[PDB]
Amino acid sequence: CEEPPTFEAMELIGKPKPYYEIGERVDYKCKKGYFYIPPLATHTICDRNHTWLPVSDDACYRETCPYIRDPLNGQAVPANGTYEFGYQMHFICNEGYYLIGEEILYCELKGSVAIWSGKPPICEKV
Amino acid sequence: DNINTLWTGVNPTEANCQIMNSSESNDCKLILTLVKTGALVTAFVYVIGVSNNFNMLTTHRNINFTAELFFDSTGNLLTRLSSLKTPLNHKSGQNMATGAITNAKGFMPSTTAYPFNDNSREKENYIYGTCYYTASDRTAFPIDISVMLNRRAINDETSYCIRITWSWNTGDAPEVQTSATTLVTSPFTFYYIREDD
Amino acid sequence: DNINTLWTGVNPTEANCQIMNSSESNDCKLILTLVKTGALVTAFVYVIGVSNNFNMLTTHRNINFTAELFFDSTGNLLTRLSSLKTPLNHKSGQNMATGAITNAKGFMPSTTAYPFNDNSREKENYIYGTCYYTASDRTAFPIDISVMLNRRAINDETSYCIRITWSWNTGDAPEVQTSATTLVTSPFTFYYIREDD
Amino acid sequence: DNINTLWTGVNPTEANCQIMNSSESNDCKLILTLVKTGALVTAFVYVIGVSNNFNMLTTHRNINFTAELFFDSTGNLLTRLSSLKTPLNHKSGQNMATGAITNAKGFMPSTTAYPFNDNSREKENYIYGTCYYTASDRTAFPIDISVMLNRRAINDETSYCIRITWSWNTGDAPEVQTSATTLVTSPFTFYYIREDD
Amino acid sequence: VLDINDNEPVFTQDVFVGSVEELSAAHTLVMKINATDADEPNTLNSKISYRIVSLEPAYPPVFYLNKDTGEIYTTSVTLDREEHSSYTLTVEARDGNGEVTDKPVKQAQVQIRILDVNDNIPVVENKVLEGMVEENQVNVEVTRIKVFDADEIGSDNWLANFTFASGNEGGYFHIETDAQTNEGIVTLIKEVDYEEMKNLDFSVIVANKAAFHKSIRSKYKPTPIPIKVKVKNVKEGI
């Protein structure tokens, strides 16, 4: 094999080598900001075909931000229907109330931690 | 040879301690372990909030709550008076073993080091420290811990007493209404001279 | 009966840990000792700076560096993933014993007390404390230590994890360009419930 | 199996330590316990004031006082130079045992981890912490503790050294003239690597 | 014949009154509420079930009324007198089932006063303090210093006790405490010669008359507040 595959959310461990003998095993590690869930494998072996046996980055899942409860007299909703980072959260105030804080929050990955871009707003009576 | 340990067990399934007497239907889960180290006992204590009224404390600026453990002359927990409503026992894996307690008295605070009803040595009956609360924004929040060892007996059965008071008094609460999830305090480790077996 | 200790040894001859991701080769000397005390494990950790870049960290006002230790199902350290690049072993004098580890798993953090990928119990996976740095002027500069236990895995082999993050963020750095000699941290001792042998 | 403890006994009848350099006729009661925990030693130390001059320290806003323990090649205390004026012995109930000490050397600070006359590893000979003093009005005043381990030997006999320095610098004295009763320090527990048996 | 809940418990007084100290621990008896009847005691229709109908200001939940005993305690939410000086409670007593029914029952008012403890360090609002001493003048107010404390107005926890950190070893200045506004009146009690050019600046520390509470003691850092003193150059003549 002359090319250990590259993936979006999982990085090879160690310095890549130009060539690996048949049977050599290469292990990966889930990238900074992603975390492993079993039972999918995160390693591969160079077969007799000079092709790496099938392996995918489905083992690692994106880091998620803390859960937010609905503001009093309000309603929070995952803008993209989940909590993984790089996504946003929307807030809506009921008919009889108005929003006072940030309308939309963005959950961003700082280093290895996903954090919300601010604090949840509140709804105030009109 | 696990008899050196006496603990509540790791993550009990159901709440095993009532801290707030204002509530019923035990409102918390107290993880307390005591391990013999020669002439000392190392105590490893923390609390997991279960009830809504307990978990809502993180939303308040000023808080104080105490866990009281009264042990009889044989070293067995007085469940009726104690905040911890389940007996302590030896380590059997990650749980509590079932059977008689092997030298419970050895785990009790020493009466000589920590006496009863003696004002002249009152100051010897206090231990202090700090634990931490992990907030939603991942910023650690310091919580003061005061441990009083067998200073005052309540009735004729109380032979040893441990009162662990968690408290905090700051300007801003650790959490807000829409972020508070559960009150889990970082483990607090302290030491005390132990009564003879 | 030295099997109750799992440590790096006392002052290893050569640097055994690589912390700075910005650097290559080992840059410091991580002294880590785990003692099995009944139902707990006492961890005793500190760092001795070796590389010039690592030692120069004392000149910067806001710094944080993390030592990652990953252990497989048998409790053996995963060298390629962990910052420490030499396996721990039992006590033999002031050096590491040579041979298979007798029940390494027993020294690993308990999965029940400290779970994996459980968002409802995240707060249970954190410990905090303070260590100290002895400045050139013999004053103690405080350093914050955050220990994260086996919350998140990174591959199919990592079964336990200890992340020890040293940090400080102050107006003035502990040292200046001309006084920086070596970066060593006062020992930090913490405790955690241990997985069954 | 009490040979794992080396202490001064729980509340000795008569004072057994001379701290204040300004007085003689040893003036305080230093309770010290050393417990062997695998490859470490747990040191559990506090001081109970006896003489009036010591107990009057609480009426001052800036105090420091040091206990120096010097140990020979066999780990036996040098009663002539050490602040403590009674040999340490093993646990026998709440009192010291009578007889030769069984492997005293194993309790001493390790020369390898903590060396003599080495300005490159000076920073490795310091440990730091905090204890508390309980006032009459139930106020816990924090007291800084610095432990210097076997860095400098005054004479030929000294093979190991432990210098425990208590200090506080507060705003208002913890006590007044009519309120000081005794200067009891809340227990302080630290750890150090122990010399080979 | 079986006794029935045809009547209601009679409160021993229309307006119950008690008090509790600020920063009091959890589960300290604040009051006891008393009510009785004329039925057979220790029965379903005679056991008195107390219930808090309402609490002004209702937040935080700082009090707890035991239904079986009628004694009002504090709870884990520690009191803070500065946030709320007093609390009002509308309470009621019932029997039989002991639950809230459509039929109303007599209600009583319970007024709980929070007793102030010295849990706030005074601060000096003025940042630039400078007097102007007239030469060779005795018993003259040199200047004033503003002190603020959030504790109860008029109590020993609010009045400021001024002490001289330094700069008055010559016994020149004395500070009185104006309790009307909790201020420090710095006055000169000795003659000063401008030719001597006596360097009259000093530094003082501010503290409440009563001793500080255990919650803030051991955290008190007495930062010296300097005050600069100028001496007038009186033109006696040439």
List chains adjacent to chain E, taking adjacency as at least 3 C-beta pairs closer than 8 Å.
B, D
How far is Cα E105 from Cα E7, in angstroms, rounded to an integer?
9
Containing D54, the helix (H) or strand (E) segment is: helix D52-55
3-state SS assignment for residue A48: coil
Six token digits for residue B172: 């801003």
Q: How many CB atoms lie within 10 A of CB D11?
A: 18
Q: Which amino acid is at B29?
A: K
For the CA atoms of D17, D19, D20, D26, what is the dihedral angle to 10 degrees? Answer: 10
DSSP secondary structure string for all residues of E156-181 = TTTSEEEEEEES-TTS-EEEEEETTT
Q: Would you kindly state where each structural domain of chain A is located, as residue ranges?
A: 10-62, 74-125
The parent domain of residue C122 ranges over: 5-193
For residue C117, CA distances in Å to A83, B11, C154 come to: 14, 16, 11
Residue E16: beta bridge partners?
Answer: E110
Phi, psi of C134 (to 5 degrees): -85, 105
Is the peptide bond preceding residue A39 cis, with omega within 30 degrees of 0? yes
Q: Residue C152 and residue A36: Cβ atoms within 8 Å?
A: yes
Q: Could you tell me if residue C111 is left (phi over 0), alpha (psi between -120 and 50 degrees) or otherwise beta?
A: alpha
DSSP secondary structure string for all residues of C92-131 = ETTEE--S--TTGGGGSBPTTTS-SS-TTSGGGGEEEEEE
How far is Cα E42 from Cα E74, in angstroms, rounded to an integer?
27
How far is Cα E4 from Cα E39, in angstroms, rounded to an integer?
9
How many H helices and E strands in chain C? 1, 10
Is the peptide bond preceding residue B115 cis, with omega within 30 degrees of 0? no
Assess contact for B138 and B147: CB atoms under 8 A.
no
Residue E91: beta bridge partners?
Answer: E52, E108
Q: CA neighbours within 13 Å on the CB side: how many for D100?
A: 4
For residue A4, CA distances in Å to A10, A48, C81, C146 come to: 12, 15, 18, 36
How far is Cα D20 from Cα E106, in angstroms, rounded to an integer?
70
Is the peptide bond preceding residue E60 cis, with omega within 30 degrees of 0? yes
The whole-angstrom distance between B176's CA and the closest CA on chain A is 10
The whole-angstrom distance between B136's CA and the closest CA on chain A is 7
Six token digits for residue E53: 């109908």
Q: Which amino acid is at E139?
A: N
Q: Residue A69 and residue B179: Cβ atoms within 8 Å?
A: yes
How far is Cα E134 from Cα E193, in angstroms, rounded to an integer?
10
3-state SS assignment for residue E18: strand
Residue of D81, D72, D68, D80 whose CA lies nearest to D101: D72
Containing B169, the helix (H) or strand (E) segment is: strand B160-169
How far is Cα C61 from Cα C58, in angstroms, rounded to an integer?
8
Q: DSSP state, C196?
A: P
Residue E230: beta bridge partners?
Answer: E132
- Please give the distance of CA E119 from its chain centroid, rounded to a whole number: 8
Q: How many CB atoms lie within 10 A of CB B144?
A: 16
DSSP secondary structure string for all residues of D126-140 = EEEEEEEEE-TTS-E
Of B123, B128, B190, nearest to D182 by CB-CB distance is B123
How far is Cα B88 from Cα B104, in angstroms, rounded to an integer?
9
Containing D52, the helix (H) or strand (E) segment is: helix D52-55
Phi, psi of C59 (to 5 degrees): -80, -15
How far is Cα C128 from Cα C191, in angstroms, rounded to an integer?
11
By C-alpha distance, the chain B residue nearest E80 is B62
How far is Cα D44 from Cα D34, in angstroms, rounded to an integer?
6
Strands C95-96 and D5-7: unpaired
Assess contact for B182 and C123: CB atoms under 8 A.
yes
Phi, psi of D151 (to 5 degrees): -90, -45
3-state SS assignment for residue C51: coil
How far is Cα D90 from Cα D103, in angstroms, rounded to an integer?
11
How far is Cα B184 from Cα E158, in angstroms, rounded to an integer?
37
Q: Which amino acid is at B109?
A: P
Alpha helices in chain C (DSSP H): 52-55
Six token digits for residue B111: 């009466």
**Residue E96 CB contacts under 8 Å (≥ 6 apart), including other chains:** E5, E44, E45
3-state SS assignment for residue B37: strand
How far is Cα E143 from Cα E164, in angstroms, rounded to an integer?
15
How far is Cα D190 from Cα D37, in angstroms, rounded to an integer?
12
Dihedral (CA of B7, B9, B14, B15) sign: positive
Strand ranges (E), chain E: 10-11, 15-21, 29-32, 35-36, 49-56, 63-65, 71-74, 86-94, 107-115, 123-124, 130-133, 140-148, 160-166, 173-178, 183-188, 202-208, 225-231
Q: Residue B178 and residue A66: Cβ atoms within 8 Å?
A: no
How far is Cα C180 from Cα D65, in angstroms, rounded to an integer?
30
Residue of D75, A82, D145, D46 whose CA lies nearest to B40: D46
Question: What does the radius of gyration of chain E's CA atoms come to, in whole angstroms?
Answer: 29
Q: DSSP state, C55?
A: H
Touch E-A: 3+ C-beta pairs under 8 A:
no
Containing D55, the helix (H) or strand (E) segment is: helix D52-55
Question: What does the radius of gyration of chain D's CA atoms come to, in whole angstroms?
Answer: 17
**Whether domain A74-125 has CATH 2.10.70.10:** yes
How far is Cα D123 from Cα C185, in angstroms, rounded to an integer?
8
DSSP secondary structure string for all residues of A64-121 = BPPP-PPPTTEEEEETTSS-BTTEEEEEEE-TTEEE-S-SEEEEEEETTEEEESS---
Q: CA neighbours within 13 Å on the CB side: how many for D56?
A: 6
For the CA atoms of E163, E165, E168, E173, what is the dihedral angle to 10 degrees? Answer: -30
Dihedral (CA of D54, D60, D61, D63) sign: negative
Assess contact for C95 and C2: CB atoms under 8 A.
no
The whole-angstrom distance between D20's CA and the closest CA on chain B is 21
Residue with tokens 């379903």: E44
Residue B35: beta bridge partners?
Answer: B5, B42
- CATH code reported for the domain at E10-115: 2.60.40.60
Chain A residues within 8 angstroms (CB to CB) of chain C = 13-14, 27-30, 35-43, 59, 64, 67
How far is Cα C81 from Cα C160, in angstroms, rounded to an integer?
12
Phi, psi of E175 (to 5 degrees): -115, 120
Q: Is E155 exposed, middle or buried (0-12, 13-18, 19+ CB in 10 A)?
A: middle
Residue of B176, B140, B142, B189 whose CA lies nearest to B57: B176
By C-alpha distance, the chain D residue nearest B112 is D10
How far is Cα B70 from Cα B150, in angstroms, rounded to an integer?
9
Of C2, C10, C189, nearest to D113 by CB-CB distance is C10
Method used to obtain the model = cryo-EM
Question: What does the radius of gyration of chain C's CA atoms come to, in whole angstroms?
Answer: 17
Q: Which amino acid is at B112?
A: T
Of B11, B35, B189, nearest to C112 by CB-CB distance is B11
DSSP secondary structure string for all residues of B47-83 = EEE-SHHHHGGGGSSEEEEEEEEEE-TTS-B-TTTSS
Q: Residue B123 and residue D133: Cβ atoms within 8 Å?
A: yes
Q: Which residues of E118-144 are buried (b: 16+ CB within 10 A; e: fewer)?
A: bbbbbebeeeebebebebebeeeebbb
Q: Residue D171 and residue E214: Cβ atoms within 8 Å?
A: no
Six token digits for residue A88: 């946003």
Residue with tokens 């494990």: C41
How far is Cα C85 from Cα C121, in angstroms, rounded to an integer?
31
- CATH code reported for the domain at A10-62: 2.10.70.10
Residue of C181, C177, C174 whose CA lies nearest to C58: C174
For chain A, say whether B64 makes contact (Cβ under 8 Å). no
Alpha helices in C127-166 (DSSP H): none
Residue of C162, C149, C148, C195 whose CA lies nearest to C36: C195
Three-state SS annotation for D56-121? HHHHCCEEEEEEEEEECCCCCECCCCCCECCCCECEECCEECCCCCCCHHHHCECCCCCCCCCCCC
How far is Cα E173 from Cα E137, in angstroms, rounded to an integer?
12
Six token digits for residue A74: 């309000």
What is the resolution in angstroms? 3.2
3-state SS assignment for residue D18: coil
Q: Could you tell me if residue B75 is left (phi over 0), alpha (psi between -120 and 50 degrees) or otherwise beta?
A: left
Containing D49, the helix (H) or strand (E) segment is: strand D40-49
Six token digits for residue B20: 């707030």
**Whether domain E123-231 has CATH 3.30.70.20:** no
Assess contact for A42 and A64: CB atoms under 8 A.
no
3-state SS assignment for residue B137: coil
How far is Cα C191 from Cα D40, in angstroms, rounded to an integer?
14
Touch A-D: 3+ C-beta pairs under 8 A:
no
Q: Which amino acid is at E77?
A: V
CATH of residue B160: 2.60.90.10
How far is Cα E103 from Cα D135, in angstroms, rounded to an integer?
55
Residue of E125, E134, E137 whose CA lies nearest to E184: E125
Q: Which contacts (CB < 8 Å, 24+ apart) does range C23-32 have?
A: C23/C51, C23/C53, C23/C54, C25/C51, C26/C50, C26/C51, C26/C85, C27/C51, C27/C53, C27/C54, C28/C54, C28/C183, C30/C67, C30/C83, C30/C84, C31/C7, C31/C187, C31/D113, C32/C7, C32/C8, C32/C69, C32/C84, C32/C88
Q: Residue D196 and residue C93: Cβ atoms within 8 Å?
A: yes
By C-alpha distance, the chain D residue nearest B39 is D5
How far is Cα E150 from Cα E172, in angstroms, rounded to an integer?
31
Six token digits for residue E227: 């005050």
Residue of D110, D131, D127, D103 whose CA lies nearest to D187: D131
Assess contact for C72 and C156: CB atoms under 8 A.
no
Q: Would you kindly state where each structural domain of chain E is located, as residue ranges?
A: 10-115, 123-231
Six token digits for residue C106: 């027993």
Q: Is D84 exposed, middle or buried (0-12, 13-18, 19+ CB in 10 A)?
A: buried
How far is Cα E26 from Cα E8, in angstroms, rounded to an integer?
32
Assess contact for D68 and D148: CB atoms under 8 A.
no
Six token digits for residue C186: 């006062």
Assess contact for B152 and B116: CB atoms under 8 A.
yes
Residue of D95, D45, D36 whose CA lies nearest to D67: D45
How far is Cα C155 from Cα C161, in angstroms, rounded to an integer?
12
Q: What is the total count of domains within chain B?
A: 1
Residue of B147, B166, B146 whose CA lies nearest to B54: B166
Six token digits for residue C113: 């007390």
Q: Which contacts (CB < 8 Å, 24+ apart) does range E59-66 have?
A: E60/B60, E62/E87, E63/E30, E63/E87, E63/E89, E63/E112, E64/B22, E65/E33, E65/E89, E65/E91
Q: Which amino acid is at B49?
A: G
How far is Cα B100 from Cα C77, in angstroms, rounded to an integer?
39
Phi, psi of A17 (to 5 degrees): -105, 150
Q: Residue E78 and residue B22: Cβ atoms within 8 Å?
A: no
Strands E130-133 and E225-231: parallel
The whole-angstrom distance between A100's CA and the closest CA on chain C is 29
Q: How open is the CA angle E119-E125-E131, to the nearest 5 degrees?
A: 130
Q: Which amino acid is at B153?
A: A
Q: How many CB atoms lie within 10 A of CB A82?
A: 12
Dihedral (CA of D20, D24, D29, D31) sign: positive
For residue E63, CA distances in Å to A111, B50, E19, E28, E214 come to: 45, 21, 12, 10, 23
Six token digits for residue C107: 């020294």
3-state SS assignment for residue B128: strand
How far is Cα E71 from Cα E67, in angstroms, rounded to an integer?
8
The whole-angstrom distance between E103's CA and the closest CA on chain B is 27
